[PDB]
Design a protein around this ligand. Sequence first.
Ligand SMILES: *CCC(=O)NCCNc1c(NCc2ccc(Nc3ncc(Cl)c(Nc4ccccc4C(=O)NC)n3)cc2)c(=O)c1=O
Length: 258
Amino acid sequence: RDYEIQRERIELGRCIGEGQFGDVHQGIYMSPENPAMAVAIKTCKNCTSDSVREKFLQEALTMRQFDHPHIVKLIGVITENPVWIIMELCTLGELRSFLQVRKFSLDLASLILYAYQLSTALAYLESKRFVHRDIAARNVLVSATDCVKLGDFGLSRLPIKWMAPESINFRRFTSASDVWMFGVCMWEILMHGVKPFQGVKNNDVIGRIENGERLPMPPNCPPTLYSLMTKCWAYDPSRRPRFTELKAQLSTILEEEK
Ligand SMILES: *CCC(=O)NCCNc1c(NCc2ccc(Nc3ncc(Cl)c(Nc4ccccc4C(=O)NC)n3)cc2)c(=O)c1=O
């Protein structure tokens, strides 16, 4: 309907991060007669200028296009300076940090759930023929112990250690290259938020990948799941599963593990 939001309904709280345009805050959106809603608020430092402001607001319009359980939904915008983008809060924060500290509290079944949930989101985006370009555990947020979501697409934006070979060599970015990225993210999750190619330099990654080196099997990851990953890492983009195939396969792998 109308995504314009009155500023007086928003109560800005603590900073939770930074993006290219300004800090990101959590906060509350209040409405007469209805419960308070937790939100995240992107602020923009340089919005007075029309060119920055139009770049900033284009990020809300990008999120406006999507409607899916496992992608953050846009709530509204405030267009009067300072300009703010209001999104839904995932109140448990970023996936990686969540995974490091909740290691002894989650099982393998939970981790495969996250991968299945992210795949539904990414298939959805594949059916809309949208190309993310920045899949990585660092860009996934936690709404509940059983619910993760792709974060704000604008806050997600070279991520050499996540990128397909064609992405690095030719700046080609397709749904197939998203499938590669997703496999690195899936590895990250079975690794509880460990980063790929820790200690390796960015300019050497493409060589190690050209030679055929691949991220190893994570401790206590089922072989059928790692098999799935290595297929996302096929050098030939044509031989990488589509997100619809990944969703179906992960659904089976989850069913078996639970
Ligand atoms: C403010 C200064 C600073 O150093 N901040 C870092 C830690 N301060 C802090 C946090 N951070 C934890 C945190 C992160 C995210 C969320 N939830 C949430 N829900 C919805 C959205 Cl759209 C976002 N977006 C977002 C926020 C930050 C970074 C990246 C994104 C994003 O979209 N990435 C793709 N976040 C809750 C808590 C905290 O609680 C602190 O204090």
